[PDB]
Homo-oligomer: A and B are copies of this chain.
Amino acid sequence: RNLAALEAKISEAKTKKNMLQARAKAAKANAELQQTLGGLGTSSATSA
Which residues of chain B come closer than 8 Å to A9, judged between CB atoms?
40, 42
Give the contact-size bracket for chain A. 10 to 19
Contact A2–B37 (Cβ < 8 Å): yes
A20 to B: closest C-beta gap in Å: 10
- Copies of this protein, total: 2
Which residues of chain B come closer than 8 Å to A45, judged between CB atoms?
13, 17
Task: Mark A11-36 against chain B: 1 for CB-CB distance below 8 A, else 0.
Answer: 00100010000000000000001100
- Report the nearest B residue to A5, measured CB to CB: B37
A30 to B: closest C-beta gap in Å: 10
Which residues of chain B come closer than 8 Å to A42, judged between CB atoms?
9-10, 13
A37 to B: closest C-beta gap in Å: 4
